[PDB]
Nucleic acid binder design. Sequence first.
RNA 1: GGAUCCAUUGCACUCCGGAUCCAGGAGAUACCAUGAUCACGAAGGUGGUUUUCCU
Length: 240
Amino acid sequence: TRPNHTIYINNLNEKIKKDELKKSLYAIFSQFGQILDILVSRSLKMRGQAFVIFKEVSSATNALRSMQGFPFYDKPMRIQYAKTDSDIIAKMKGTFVEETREERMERKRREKIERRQQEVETELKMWDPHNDPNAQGDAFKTLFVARVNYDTTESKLRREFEVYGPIKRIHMVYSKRSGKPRGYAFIEYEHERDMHSAYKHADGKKIDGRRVLVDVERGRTVKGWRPRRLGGGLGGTRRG
RNA sequence: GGAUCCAUUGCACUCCGGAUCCAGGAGAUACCAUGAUCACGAAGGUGGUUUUCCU
Ligand SMILES: [Mg+2]
Ligand SMILES: [Mg+2]
Ligand SMILES: [Mg+2]
């Protein structure tokens, strides 16, 4: 009830968004004087209310007198003086008395990646196909067949690839865990020539409904080869 | 942000009521698809799913 630099306005329409409300209060209330600020919140405690801070108390007093009851967004404005000085008034007077989520996130990706690289590095030095009991015979006579139907039998496969020449050995690969087939095999020919021939002619060959992929064995032939699980591999189905 | 419902007439100046759902944004997803080319396996990315923020 005692005059003040700041006026308090309530009974405001609660549907109106914050900037709109600040805007429309500025338009209406500058007519009475210089405004330092209009404070609005739409929180539970503060919605329906505004503090208009004027430079002079006299503007405040005239703004209060004139606008009392004024129709504003289909609602009469209720205006009083603020009970207490607004911080910027009080400081003007010397009356005044009192990892982000973006960082935690970025750090976490960074560590997973690094953690991953170390894992791969460690596996890598466990990896040696020349010392694997599964990898036998002449690498240079060995074909690599992937994308096989899980249903395809070792027979059907030996049949399809025998056309290119006598086969010394087939090793289809199974999960050491489930024992489910991995969809790939090594086929060692008697003669390098016949492997080369399967290589030229069998790629894309349809066996049990699925186009198979045919390549040479690279594990034991290609300088610097790493398999897909060690960050290498060929093919591009899942590049992005 | 927005839609519906509910609560609120509140004196602040450190965001910030509830519910259910929607759009965009940014996270996260253990699960599904992509049946990933090297002897059981990438990670992830992309598309789902679920979920947490922001508007
Ligand atoms: Mg090695
Ligand atoms: Mg998968
Ligand atoms: Mg994946």
